[PDB]
Design a protein around this ligand. Structure first.
Ligand code: Y0J
Length: 119
């Protein structure tokens, strides 16, 4: 029922994501010189370095907020892809599956801890 445990669990999961080859394109903000129309399609750039820095600054209150930003990385990739068969989109789908498999317990444990706190 540790209400704070999610933060180190998220740090460890980001470490695993950074070791995944599939995270390569998502590890820093999209380069606008490589993709000059990127901000005509995508509203809010997110990448994993921005998520890690936000966590490490103490600017997430809950793992739900971190999860929303990670999911934005993946929805941005789906919105920008010209094809569902894209290399970088295909990498996003595998990385998303990996992320969702690991974040599930982090969310469940946090929400259970909060419920216990408010019992
Ligand atoms: O420019 C990058 N990644 C990147 N990672 C860097 C590290 C260092 C310097 C520049 C970097 O640029 N990507 C393009 C857009 N993409 C898509 O979601 C997508 C779907 C279909 C085609 O692209 C996301 C990542």
């Amino acid at each position: 029922y540790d209400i704070q445990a999610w933060k180190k669990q998220c740090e460890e999961l980001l470490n695993l994501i950074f070791q995944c080859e599939d995270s390569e394109p998502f590890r820093q903000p999209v380069d606008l010189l490589e993709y000059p129309d990127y901000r005509d399609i995508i509203d809010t750039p997110m990448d994993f370095a921005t998520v890690r820095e936000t966590l490490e600054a103490g600017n997430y209150e809950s793992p739900m907020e971190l999860c929303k930003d990670v999911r934005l990385i993946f929805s941005n990739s789906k919105a920008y892809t010209p094809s569902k068969r894209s290399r970088i989109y295909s990498m996003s789908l595998r990385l998303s599956a990996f992320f969702e498999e690991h974040i599930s317990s982090v969310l469940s444990d946090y929400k259970s801890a909060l419920r216990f706190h408010k019992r």
